[PDB]
Amino acid sequence: ALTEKTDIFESGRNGNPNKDGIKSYRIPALLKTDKGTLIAGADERRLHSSDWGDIGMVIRRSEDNGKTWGDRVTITNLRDNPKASDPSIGSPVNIDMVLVQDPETKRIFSIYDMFPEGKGIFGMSSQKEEAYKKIDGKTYQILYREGEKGAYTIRENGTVYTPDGKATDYRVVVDPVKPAYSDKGDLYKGDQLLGNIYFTTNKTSPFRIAKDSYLWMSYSDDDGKTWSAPQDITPMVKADWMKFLGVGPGTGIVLRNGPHKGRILIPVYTTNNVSHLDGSQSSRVIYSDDHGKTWHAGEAVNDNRQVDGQKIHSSTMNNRRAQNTESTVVQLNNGDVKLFMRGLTGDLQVATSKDGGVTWEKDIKRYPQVKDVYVQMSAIHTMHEGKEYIILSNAGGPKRENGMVHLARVEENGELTWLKHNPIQKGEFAYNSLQELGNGEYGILYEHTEKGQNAYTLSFRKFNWEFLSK
Amino acid sequence: ALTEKTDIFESGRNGNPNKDGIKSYRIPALLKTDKGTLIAGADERRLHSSDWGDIGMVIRRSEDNGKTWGDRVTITNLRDNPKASDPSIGSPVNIDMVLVQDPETKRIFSIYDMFPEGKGIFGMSSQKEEAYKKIDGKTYQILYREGEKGAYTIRENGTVYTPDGKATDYRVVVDPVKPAYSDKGDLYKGDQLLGNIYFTTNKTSPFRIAKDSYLWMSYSDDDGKTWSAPQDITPMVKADWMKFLGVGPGTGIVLRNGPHKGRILIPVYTTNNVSHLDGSQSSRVIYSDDHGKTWHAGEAVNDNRQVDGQKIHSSTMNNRRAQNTESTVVQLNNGDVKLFMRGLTGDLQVATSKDGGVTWEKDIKRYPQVKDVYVQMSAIHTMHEGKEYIILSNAGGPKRENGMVHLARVEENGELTWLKHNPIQKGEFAYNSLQELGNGEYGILYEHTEKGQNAYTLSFRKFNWEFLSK
């Protein structure tokens, strides 16, 4: 009914790197593809377990439903700043992926955060630094030159233009070609490599991007074997007021029914400049109606939400307990979208959208039946014997421990009834990602440690309906 | 050399209404047209002197250079909410105008603030209420309905659409026809008047606009005699992060030389949601390059500005002393644009733009020769014999008192050499607006009180080069 665990990404032990030189893996995503392949994605956290440093976005593939797994494939690994004083914060950063496959095109997307060199989200400037400029209708990423106020721009072919609109002999590698695209952002003056636009300290080149928060996408058209260069989708979805915008990691969905069938939904969340991480973390989705070419931001759950008899908005709120952060998204057979959101009530919080994830109903539903210890979760739709269910996995508590799989019946009015709660992993348990495998089987990729393992080793189990019904 | 004062807009006395039932006039704008007409504009503040209540945007014309003045012409006067409990905050508000004429098309523009019913800027919602939505490429104003979360929209012909995009039987007066356009915003169902979308208390209709900050424009093609219905320019210029966006009142300019010649410049300022009126007031200009058809926001003087060794941005700043508010704008013969900004240094603060008002140099210049008591000022370019000068008028201080006219030589690099400082009005003295009359003559419209006049009576004096020079 429940398989023994298979370690997919193994961390080092007792604070040492593993044999591949990697201290930590974090942030699992699991995707069953049209070919039946399982793709397991993770942050490869080389130097330490924190949300910054030298991190690669990686996947492994299983062609036998999780029994065996191929070599690590690295999607993106930006090169470190070789002159950084603190290597622990010395690299441009990618973290936190969401995987999804388009069922019409078979294109597989990995969407993940990016920050320039520094302490990840904690490296963002304290005052806003504009990251893009719209010039004659085209959006260009901004560069700042040492000692100068003005916004240089990266235009076609990566040619750097002066704030006054004059082409220079500086060029940015906008079409990276090295393994894992480690050359992305490299800055050249003609033939000479000078540095990298993502470096923020001890620079050898004149130019850097804004110390802001970015969203990148990479895609695979060969079942996860090879991956595109990263696409910068930030300007499509990030409003000027947003401070952080980043993914709720795991596995997104494509709507399978209703007027918005085919729409791809990716959980994200934002902060504002009023209260940032103290009081404004707010869930929403971004979405594509054209198979991943263009993206749009849905409204926040928190936009025009009534909290304590007063309205809030994600752009202006400052309310610690009204926050909702990383989320997981499911569509019901009736077309409604449920967003299960990490939050600070101690129990499961759920928002509902009747318009394919663009706007949210006025009430967030809470379920005391399911504890939320403030950690990521995953949830998936499933049918069992003509009946509709949702399976949700997260930590049982009291801390990030005792992995649970929760089973809810989806009632005829779209409400949820929690029926079963079963342990899947004793001891440490954090982030996780669920997938249906077919024939009454489900798979999960999750964070756990034992035997001195560093946070975390990402392991895989399969379970069936008999496990769920216990 | 200096005429006696002529009262153009007369306030009441000792706290009472004047003979027309108007307590106060405020916020002068003076415009010398191509025909030679003088247009004097003001807020007609019926109920009291504050920046809210029942206020009309008015002008008077003089066809003989300030000797005689015609009847008051009301550009815009939104109707009050007849059901408001407190009539002093009981009307949708317009306040603060900027006048300018396009020298090519001769069209005259009046641009001014608008707020829905309440205490003016102090009636803005504490949390963001979205004011506009883009649907099918088109931008629509939002309406909120009592007890409903979703955004209704005002679409073609004023027809109200549901949040889910269905036409209702409700309609908004979007093309007002009553004198002074007092029917603007009226909410009808079929042919029955139900209320007004600008009303925010004790409503008789289901709908209101966002409690936000707006910018409206009215224009005249007949030398100020008649005026168009108000045009909502807000969505063209107001970023999502901006809380307040309003004009720096007085008289705007059209650039007369350089690559941007023809551009109309209107001083405005913003606040953000981080510190609002406490630490974020920030000057900039909005501009039109197509004779007032479309408008764009320039960058703030405060954007990426270095203050006490650290950068600020207008969208995130919280620095009382770094604020700059209402301003007056002048183009030099060398093409530079100077922005003289009301601020909190006690002396004259000046920003410079080399690109027609879009971006500003890193340093704000302070001129200790000119006191600034934290009050609006006006400034104009002038040629005399034929050397280039600026004339600037404000209060000499210590309070809002002792009107001064300041004369600067503009040097070839755009530096200002202050030559003369001449008193023009003893006693109370506040907002003002200068114009060149020709033949070495200049006219000014300013706020002053005497003999128990309520703030303010707006008066007009002419002076010549003889007065300026001693």
Ligand SMILES: CCC(CC)O[C@@H]1C=C(C(=O)O)C[C@H](N)[C@H]1NC(C)=O
């Ligand atoms: C930014 C929100 C939160 C602050 C504690 O950090 C998240 C928490 C995490 C966690 O609770 O384990 C891991 C996430 N990968 C991280 N995200 C980022 C962007 O760093």
Ligand SMILES: CCC(CC)O[C@@H]1C=C(C(=O)O)C[C@H](N)[C@H]1NC(C)=O
């Ligand atoms: C909003 C800035 C300030 C409040 C501190 O109010 C301004 C001050 C004024 C003043 O100092 O006399 C008059 C302006 N008409 C007013 N503007 C608005 C929009 O109300």
Ligand SMILES: [Cl-]
């Ligand atoms: Cl560099």
Ligand SMILES: [Cl-]
């Ligand atoms: Cl009403």
